[PDB]
Write a protein that binds this ligand. Structure first.
Ligand SMILES: [Zn+2]
Ligand SMILES: [Zn+2]
Ligand SMILES: [Zn+2]
Ligand SMILES: [Zn+2]
Lengths: 436, 263, 331, 78
C-alpha cells in the first residue's frame, strides 16, 4: 500500500480491445456477433460513420471525413476518428496523389457481410435459475454456509484477485477488490468476470478469440428459442460447463446437446444499468433525508450489502430499516470502497416511489455524506528520499530540474532547500552526483 | 429507436415495360436493394424497426411484416417473409383497365397510421423518430391530388420525415411532399447503382442528415393553375365559398354554382 | 356539417388581465394555463387555417391594450405570449374598450371575412366606461362574431353578447374541457345568413431563386434587421420582394397564396363521415385491420360507411384526426 | 400519355411471369463497378452533387451600407 489503493476500474471494452494485437483483432471480427458487439460499443459519430462507409469500395480522402462535421464539434470529433483508427476498423490507404484514403477493414467487413448474407425449461424459471446460481456465487464471496461453488470457480475467484486465500488451511477471505466488486451492477459484475477471466486465458488451453465470439454469441440470443451444442470443440465444452457453473447458461445434462442462454447472458454488455432503475430488478431502497434506508427486499445477500455501507436497525418480513451513519461509511471505506460505488448502488436500486424526483439519490444527503467522509482517512503516506541543507542554490534547482527531467519529482521547497525525490528512482540522481 | 418505412412503387405495368426493355435493372434488383437497405437499417442498431409496403395498382399490401446460409437470424426471417410476400403479391395478380395508374396516397396513409400505432407501443423511457422512404418508378395519377396533400400534412403534423428516390421520371407532388415535411428528394441518374445511392443518402437517420454533406436541394416549383383551362397562373381569382382557383374573372362561379354578388 | 364555413377568418383574441386571472383554480394560476393553451391555440390554428390571422389584446386595469397586431405568422404571437407570461394582472377588465379596439381594426377588413373575436374572460365585474348594449347593437350591424370562453361562472352580459352577435358561450371545468373548447374554436365555424360571399382577388407568386447564378438578378434587402435577399417570392401585382409565403401584400392589398395553402384546408369542404362503431365480435370475416394490417385484439371494431372496410382504434383516431380521409374510399 | 391498352395486357403477362422465379441475393444485386461509379458521383465533383449550396455573398462594407439601405427601403416603402 506504498503504491495507491486498489481502485476497481471497469475497462468498458475500449481499453480491453484497444491494447491487443491486430492479428488477434482481425481474427476476432471473423464472426458477425463480434462485429455487432464492437459496433454498438462505438460512440454515435463513429457509429453513423461506419454505417455510412459500409456500402463502399473506395478509400475516401481525409478531407471528406473532416468535412462531414459542423465547426463547433471538432473537440468531440477526433475521439471517434481516433477510436475507429486504433481499433483496426479504419485502415488508412492512399488515393494516388497525396490524399490519405480511409477504408473499413475488409476482414471485418467481409465477415459482417457473411453474418448478414450468404457465406423444456420455462422463461421465469430461467430467471429463477439465474438468480439462484449467481446469488450462490455472491453468497460464496460474502461467506455464507451456502458455498455450492465447485472449487474451480473458487480458484477463479482467487486468481482474479477477489478472494485471497491466506495460510492455506482454507480461509478464503475477501480482498478490497471483492468489496468493490459486490457493490457493482450485475452486467458490470458479469463483464468484470469475463474480463478478468480472459485476462488469465493463457492457462487452460483457452484462446481469447473463440471465447469472445461465444460470449458475443450468447448476448445476441433469445431466451425462447432453444439451441444445440453440435459444432463446438471440447475446450468449448469445458468452457461451457464452467459457464454453467457461473450460472449464465442453463444446461439440462452434462452430456446433453442443448443449452439455454439465461437472462444474465443476454444483458452481458459493457455499460451502465441505469441511475434510477434496472431492467433486471426494480429498485427497492427508499433513501430519506433522515439518512434512512428502507429496503423492500428480503434477501440475505442485499441485506449483507446494506450492512456493508450502512448499519441496520429493523427487520420485518417485507422490509429492512437501516441508517447511514458516518461511522458506517467510515467502516465501509476502511475496508476500501470509493464512495461512487455507494451512490451508484443506491441509484441503481432506487425504489419506484423514489423516482419522479429531480435527483435519483438526495444531493443534500450526498453533501452530508462528504462531511461524514472527511475524518477517518486523514493521513496520506508516501515513501520518499530527502535532500536537505545543500551547500549552494544553483545545484538546488539543478537537482530539482534533473528530478523533473526523469519524472521523479515528488515534493519541492522554495526557501530552506528541503526536497523529496522518489527513493527507488533516487540512485539515478545519486550516480549523477558522482558524475556531476 | 428509429423507424424506416420503405414504400416501393410496384407498378406491374412499368416494371413490365422495364423487363421487356431487357435492360440490366429489373424489379429483382429493385426489391433486392430494398431488402439490403432494410437489413442494413436493422443492422445499424439493435433497437431499429423496419416496415416495407408495396403500392400495387389496386392494393397497398405490406411486404414486411434457422440461419441456413450464414446471415443473422432475424434478417433471414425478414428476408424470407419479404421474398414470399412479393411472390404471393405479384405472381397471383389481376387485370383491370379503368384503374391502371399506380397509387401512392393509400400506402402513405397506411404508413402514417402504422407509425401512429407503433408510437403508441413505445414506452415512456424511449422515444421514436420516424421517416418514410418512397421509391417511385411510375407516373403518378393526378386524380388523387385532393387526397395526396392530406397525407403530407399528416406527416407535417406527426413529424414524420419523407424521403424520395425517384427512378425514371420526376414527380412534382412527391418533391412537393419532400419539400413540405422536411425530407429529401433525389432523382437517380443511373439505375443499377441504386443501392449505393440509398446507403449514403437515404440510410442515414435524422441525426446524420445534419452531419453529412448531402446533394443540395433542388428548387421547388409552386406552380398553380386554374380549374378552368389548366394553365399557369401568376394572379388568380379565388372564390370564398368554393375555395377554387379561377384564372379570368367570371360572373357565375362554376365550382359551387354560387349566386355571385356583383359589385 | 355540409354547410358553408367562414374560411378566411380574422380572429382576434381578447384575454383577461384581471384580478381573477391570478386565482389558482387551475394547477398554475389562470393566466399561465390560459396563456399556455393560447400558445397551443395559435399553433393549431395556423397549422390548420393558413390564410387567416390572429390579434391579441390583454385587457387590463379598465383599459384595453392591443398587445399584438392582426398578422398571420405564429412567431410574433407566441413570442408575445412568452413575453406575456411575465405580466402583472392588475385591476378589473373592460369589455367595452376591448370590443372597441377589436371593432376599430375589424371594421375595414373586407366583407367576406368572417370577422371573429374570442374573449377568454374570467372575472365577473365587467367594468365598462360606457353603455355596452349600443356596442352589441353596432357589432350586430357590423356583422362581427364574438364568442366568449368563460371561467368559473355564467355572466348575463356575456350571454347576451354571445347569443346576439352570433357566437357561443362556454364555461370551464378542467384542463381537458378547456382544451376541448379551444379545439372547438380552432375549426372554421359555420356562417349565418348575413355574411357576404364575395370573390377576393388572389395572387399566386412563384418562387424565384437567384436566376442563373445571379446573372442580372435584382438584389434587394426585404419587405418586412434583414440581410441581402438574392431571390425568393415576388408579387404578381406590385412586383415587390417577400421572403415568406403566404403574406398579405403590404403595398397592394392582394393576398398571396402558394396553393397548397388552399389545399391545406380542403378537407372542410368534402368532409369525413361517421365510422359505424361496433364493439362485439359480430360476423367479422375480415380479422385484420384494413388500415395497417394488424389483428383486432380489442373489442372495438370500426367500419366505414361507403366501402365498409375494417379499422381499429388507432386507425380511427389517426384517420379522424390527421389523415382526414378514409383509405378505402381512395381505392 | 399512357399508350394503348395492348401494353396493359403485355405488361401483365411479363410481370406475372417475372415474379414467379425469385430471390437472388448475393449475385444479382450489386456489381462493384456500379458502386464505385456511385461513390464517384456522390463525391463532391460528380453528378447529383449539383455544385449547389454555394451562396457566394458580398459582405465587404456591411454596417453603414446596411444603414443606407434601411433609410432607402423605409423611404421607398412609404
Ligand atoms: Zn365558388
Ligand atoms: Zn402587390
Ligand atoms: Zn371508406
Ligand atoms: Zn389499424
Amino acid at each position: 500500500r506504498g503504491l495507491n489503493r486498489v481502485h476497481l476500474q471497469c475497462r468498458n471494452l475500449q481499453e480491453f480491445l484497444g491494447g491487443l494485437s491486430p492479428g488477434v483483432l482481425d481474427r476476432l471480427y471473423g464472426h458477425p456477433a463480434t462485429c455487432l458487439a464492437v459496433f454498438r460499443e462505438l460512440p454515435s459519430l463513429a457509429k453513423n460513420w461506419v454505417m455510412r462507409m459500409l456500402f463502399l469500395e473506395q478509400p475516401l480522402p481525409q478531407a471528406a471525413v473532416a468535412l462531414w462535421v459542423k465547426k463547433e464539434f471538432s473537440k468531440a470529433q477526433e475521439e471517434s476518428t481516433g477510436l475507429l483508427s486504433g481499433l483496426r476498423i479504419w485502415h488508412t490507404q492512399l488515393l494516388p496523389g497525396g490524399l490519405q484514403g480511409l477504408i473499413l477493414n475488409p476482414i471485418f467487413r467481409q465477415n459482417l457481410r457473411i453474418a448478414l448474407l450468404g457465406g423444456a425449461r420455462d422463461v421465469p424459471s430461467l430467471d429463477k435459475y439465474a438468480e439462484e446460481r449467481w446469488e450462490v456465487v455472491l453468497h460464496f464471496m460474502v461467506g455464507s454456509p451456502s458455498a455450492a461453488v465447485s472449487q474451480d470457480l473458487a480458484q477463479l475467484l482467487s486468481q482474479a484477485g477477489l478472494m485471497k486465500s491466506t495460510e492455506p488451511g482454507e480461509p478464503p477471505c475477501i480482498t478490497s477488490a471483492g468489496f468493490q466488486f459486490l457493490l457493482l451492477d450485475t452486467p458490470a459484475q458479469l463483464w468484470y468476470f469475463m474480463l478478468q477471466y480472459l485476462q488469465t486465458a493463457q492457462s487452460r488451453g483457452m484462446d481469447l478469440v473463440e471465447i469472445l465470439s461465444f460470449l458475443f454469441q450468447l448476448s445476441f440470443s433469445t431466451l425462447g428459442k432453444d439451441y444445440s451444442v453440435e459444432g463446438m470443440s471440447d475446450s468449448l465444452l469445458n468452457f461451457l460447463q464452467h459457464l454453467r457453473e457461473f450460472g449464465l447458461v442453463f444446461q439440462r445434462k452434462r452430456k446433453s446437446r442443448r443449452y439455454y442462454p439465461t437472462r444474465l447472458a443476454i444483458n452481458l454488455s459493457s455499460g451502465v444499468s441505469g441511475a434510477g432503475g434496472t431492467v433486471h430488478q426494480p429498485g427497492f431502497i427508499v433513501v430519506e433525508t433522515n439518512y434512512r434506508l428502507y429496503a423492500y427486499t428480503e434477501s440475505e445477500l442485499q441485506i449483507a450489502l446494506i450492512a456493508l455501507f450502512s448499519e441496520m436497525l429493523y427487520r420485518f418480513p417485507n422490509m429492512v430499516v437501516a441508517q447511514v451513519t458516518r461511522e458506517s461509511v467510515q467502516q465501509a471505506i476502511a475496508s476500501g470502497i470509493t464512495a461512487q460505488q455507494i451512490i451508484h448502488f443506491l441509484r441503481t436500486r432506487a425504489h419506484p416511489v423514489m423516482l419522479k424526483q429531480t435527483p435519483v439519490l438526495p444531493p443534500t444527503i450526498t453533501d452530508q455524506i462528504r462531511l461524514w467522509e472527511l475524518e477517518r482517512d486523514r493521513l496520506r503516506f508516501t515513501e520518499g528520499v530527502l535532500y536537505n541543507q545543500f551547500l549552494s542554490q544553483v545545484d538546488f534547482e539543478l537537482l530539482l530540474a534533473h528530478a523533473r527531467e526523469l519524472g521523479v519529482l515528488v515534493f519541492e521547497n522554495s526557501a530552506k532547500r528541503l526536497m523529496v525525490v522518489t527513493p527507488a528512482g533516487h540512485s539515478d540522481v545519486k550516480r549523477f552526483w558522482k558524475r556531476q | 429507436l428509429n423507424l424506416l418505412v420503405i414504400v416501393v412503387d410496384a407498378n406491374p405495368i412499368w416494371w413490365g415495360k422495364q423487363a421487356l426493355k431487357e435492360s440490366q435493372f429489373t424489379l429483382s434488383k429493385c426489391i433486392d436493394a430494398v431488402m439490403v437497405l432494410g437489413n442494413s437499417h436493422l443492422f445499424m442498431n439493435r433497437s431499429n424497426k423496419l416496415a416495407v409496403i408495396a403500392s400495387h395498382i389496386q392494393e397497398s399490401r405490406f411486404l414486411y411484416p434457422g440461419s441456413k446460409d450464414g446471415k443473422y437470424e432475424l434478417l433471414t426471417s425478414a428476408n424470407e417473409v419479404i421474398v414470399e410476400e412479393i411472390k404471393d403479391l405479384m405472381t397471383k395478380s389481376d387485370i383491370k383497365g379503368q384503374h391502371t395508374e399506380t397509387l401512392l396516397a393509400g400506402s402513405l396513409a397506411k404508413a402514417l397510421c402504422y407509425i401512429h400505432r407503433m408510437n403508441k407501443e413505445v414506452k415512456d423511457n424511449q422515444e421514436m423518430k420516424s421517416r418514410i422512404l418512397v421509391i417511385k418508378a411510375a407516373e403518378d395519377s393526378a386524380l388523387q391530388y385532393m387526397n395526396f396533400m392530406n397525407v403530407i400534412f399528416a406527416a407535417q403534423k406527426q413529424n414524420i420525415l419523407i424521403d424520395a428516390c425517384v427512378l425514371d421520371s420526376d414527380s412534382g407532388l412527391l418533391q412537393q411532399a419532400c419539400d413540405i415535411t422536411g425530407g429529401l428528394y433525389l432523382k437517380v441518374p443511373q439505375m443499377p447503382s441504386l443501392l449505393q445511392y440509398l446507403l449514403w443518402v437515404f440510410l442515414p437517420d435524422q441525426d446524420q442528415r445534419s452531419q453529412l454533406i448531402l446533394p443540395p436541394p433542388v428548387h421547388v416549383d409552386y406552380r398553380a393553375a386554374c380549374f378552368c383551362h389548366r394553365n399557369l397562373i401568376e394572379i388568380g381569382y379565388v372564390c370564398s365559398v368554393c375555395l377554387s382557383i379561377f384564372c379570368n374573372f367570371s360572373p357565375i362561379c362554376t365550382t359551387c354554382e354560387t349566386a355571385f354578388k356583383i359589385s | 356539417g355540409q354547410v358553408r364555413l367562414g374560411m378566411m377568418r380574422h380572429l382576434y383574441v381578447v384575454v383577461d388581465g384581471s384580478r381573477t386571472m391570478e386565482d389558482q383554480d387551475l394547477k398554475p394560476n389562470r393566466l399561465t394555463c390560459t396563456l399556455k393553451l393560447l400558445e397551443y391555440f395559435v399553433e393549431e390554428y395556423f397549422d390548420q387555417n393558413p390564410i387567416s390571422q390572429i390579434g391579441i389584446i390583454v385587457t387590463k386595469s379598465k383599459r384595453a391594450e392591443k398587445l399584438t397586431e392582426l398578422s398571420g405568422n405564429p412567431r410574433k404571437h407566441i413570442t408575445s405570449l412568452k413575453k406575456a407570461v411575465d405580466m402583472t394582472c392588475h385591476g378589473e377588465p373592460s369589455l367595452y374598450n376591448s370590443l372597441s379596439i377589436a371593432m376599430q381594426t375589424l371594421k375595414h377588413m373586407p366583407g367576406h371575412t368572417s370577422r371573429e373575436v374570442l374573449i377568454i374572460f374570467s372575472s365577473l365585474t365587467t367594468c365598462d366606461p360606457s353603455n355596452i348594449y349600443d356596442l352589441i347593437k353596432t357589432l350586430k350591424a357590423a356583422k362581427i362574431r364574438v364568442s366568449v370562453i368563460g371561467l368559473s361562472a355564467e355572466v348575463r352580459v356575456c350571454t347576451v353578447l354571445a347569443r346576439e352577435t352570433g357566437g357561443t358561450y362556454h364555461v370551464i371545468l378542467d384542463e381537458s374541457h378547456y382544451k376541448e373548447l379551444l379545439t372547438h374554436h380552432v375549426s372554421p365555424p359555420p356562417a349565418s345568413s348575413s355574411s357576404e360571399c364575395s370573390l377576393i382577388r388572389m395572387g399566386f407568386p412563384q418562387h424565384t431563386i437567384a436566376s442563373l447564378s445571379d446573372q442580372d438578378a435584382k438584389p434587394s434587402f426585404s419587405m418586412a434587421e434583414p440581410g441581402l435577399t438574392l431571390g425568393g417570392y415576388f408579387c404578381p401585382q406590385c412586383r415587390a420582394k417577400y421572403c415568406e409565403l403566404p403574406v398579405e401584400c403590404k403595398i397592394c392589398g392582394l393576398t398571396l397564396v402558394s396553393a397548397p395553402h388552399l389545399a391545406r384546408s380542403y378537407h372542410h369542404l368534402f368532409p369525413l363521415d361517421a365510422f359505424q362503431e361496433i364493439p362485439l365480435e359480430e360476423y367479422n370475416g375480415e380479422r385484420f385491420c384494413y388500415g395497417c394490417q394488424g389483428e383486432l385484439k380489442d373489442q372495438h371494431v370500426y367500419v366505414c360507411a361507403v366501402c365498409q372496410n375494417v379499422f381499429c382504434v388507432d386507425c380511427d383516431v389517426f384517420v379522424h384526426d390527421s389523415l382526414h380521409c378514409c383509405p378505402g374510399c381512395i381505392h | 400519355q399512357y399508350a394503348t391498352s395492348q401494353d396493359i395486357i403485355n405488361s401483365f403477362q411479363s410481370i406475372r411471369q417475372e415474379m414467379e422465379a425469385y430471390t437472388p441475393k448475393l449475385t444479382q444485386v450489386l456489381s462493384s463497378s456500379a458502386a464505385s461509379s456511385t461513390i464517384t458521383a456522390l463525391s463532391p465533383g460528380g453528378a447529383l452533387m449539383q455544385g449547389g449550396t454555394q451562396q457566394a455573398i458580398n459582405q465587404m462594407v456591411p454596417n453603414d451600407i446596411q444603414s443606407e439601405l434601411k433609410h432607402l427601403y423605409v423611404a421607398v416603402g412609404e
